[PDB]
Paper text:
The crystal structure of CbTan2 was solved to 2.22 Å resolution and conformed to the expected α/β hydrolase fold, while also possessing a cap covering the active site as seen in the two previously solved bacterial tannase structures. The apo structure of CbTan2 contained two protein molecules in the asymmetric unit. A single peak was observed using size-exclusion chromatography, and comparison to a calibration curve revealed that the protein was monomeric in solution (calculated MW ≈ 51 kDa versus expected MW ≈ 55 kDa), which suggests that the dimer observed in the structure is crystallographic and not of biological relevance. The overall structure adopted the α/β hydrolase fold (6 α-helices and 8 β-sheets) with multiple inserts that formed additional 12 helices and five β-sheets, which is similar to the additional inserts observed in other crystallized bacterial tannases. A hairpin-style cap region over the active site was identified in CbTan2, formed by residues 237 to 258, and comprised of two antiparallel β-strands connected by a turn in a hairpin (β8 & 9), similar to the cap identified in TanLp. It appears that the cap of CbTan2 adopts a similar shape and may also be flexible to help accommodate very large substrates, such as environmentally derived tannins that are more complex than the model substrates used here. The catalytic triad of CbTan2 could be identified as Ser175, Asp439, and His471, which is consistent with the enzyme being a subtype B tannase, i.e., possessing a catalytic Asp residue. The catalytic serine residue is found in the sequence motif G-X-S-X-G (Gly173-Thr174-Ser175-Ala176-Gly177), which is conserved across bacterial tannases. In CbTan2, the oxyanion hole appears to be formed by the backbone nitrogen atoms of Gly74 and Ala176. A disulfide bridge was observed between C320 and C332 in both chains; however, residues 321 to 331 (α7 to η4) could not be modeled in chain B due to lack of electron density in this region.
Residue numbers in the entry: 1 to 115, 136 to 490
Write the structure that this text describes.
Amino acid sequence: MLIFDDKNYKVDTCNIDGISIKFRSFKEILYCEKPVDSIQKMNIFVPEVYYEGNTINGYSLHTAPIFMPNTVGGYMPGPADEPGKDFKGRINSIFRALKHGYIVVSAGVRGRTSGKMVGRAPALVVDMKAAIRYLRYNKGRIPGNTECIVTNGTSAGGALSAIIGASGNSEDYNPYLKEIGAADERDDIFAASCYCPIHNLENADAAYEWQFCGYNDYHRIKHVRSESGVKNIQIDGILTEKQIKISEELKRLFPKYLNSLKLKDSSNNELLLDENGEGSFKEYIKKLVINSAQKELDLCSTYKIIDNAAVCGSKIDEQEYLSIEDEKVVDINWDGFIKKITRMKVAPAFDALDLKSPENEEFGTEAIKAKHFTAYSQEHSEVEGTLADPKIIKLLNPIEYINNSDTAKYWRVRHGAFDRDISLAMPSILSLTLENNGYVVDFSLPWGIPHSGDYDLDDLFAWIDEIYTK
């Protein structure tokens, strides 16, 4: 049974670098009635002063937003967390959210290596929804405000945040939720925060080649982390003859798809590509990059009015591929920008012809290790493979659910202008689709920033506090 116990708790203190929080913790809560993996458990953390009638940033016990960060990366299992230090030694979001005054709910979710493999698509999404449904089933007994649920994640976890924010209350998920015996409740949320979300997977190959066809040297650094030791993997290479042809073919599939989304900029111009991948949607991406650089130049410019002999962050005033006239980025050598950031992944970047990508495994099943999830890669398969049910592929794509479900009103999307894990076109399609349908989006491409997340948490919290007042 799923009735929350406000008495089964411990009062804990965490001190780090001389910074202390005191909190009530309800740990290892089963959020569904028929779990299939030990990972399906959540922790709830509450600033302890709330139970003495204190306020924090104006929030009280029952009014504070509920922050829901997830731990998913590479579509791996994402286990429940607690206040402390993360894998890079920095003070983590749970700790800093509690100190800011939020209730924090950290929910573990299955992933592609769970198990019988029980955590393939759509498990990670179903599990998040069930956690949210547990909180709502217990609204009267749970601390915090379940009308102010804010999700947060990075990379694959940023995609899980986006799907949850986009697909509120869709009946597509009902059979899986009934399977794990989840509560019968609504699972929409107030706001979704996403860092470099790796999403829209069945279109990401053609978008990546749209961006990188012609640029055949790739460079990647993998940082597999452990408790004591270290293992670094650095890949450098050149596309093969076959991969150069695959690249060119994937690139030519992108325009058809982009045009079918019927996107518009803020001036109601239609955003389109011709069959060579040029046109108004390309001008738009280009202008995002210019505006990213312009913001970084804005700092360096002021910093120079004083001293002037100083060099700034990103050495932005020294990037050759930027055309600067009068402290203003006026144009950009697109070829040089791409040459600066460089390709990272081979072609295809997501749906491998040999079924070896993490996305291939995520679209496996309880029996099949991996599947394809594009028509191209199934056609040109190098191994014996099957196509994943297009009904399951949909369950992971938030673009399919904006304009036809209970979508969160407020959106914060961040993607580093130097993050080449996915084409810049993806975060852009997501923001444009949301803005075109009347949603409120805070979208930025931070200059010089590679594949990462949670690097501006003070601004994230301030965004939460602002939308809370609206």
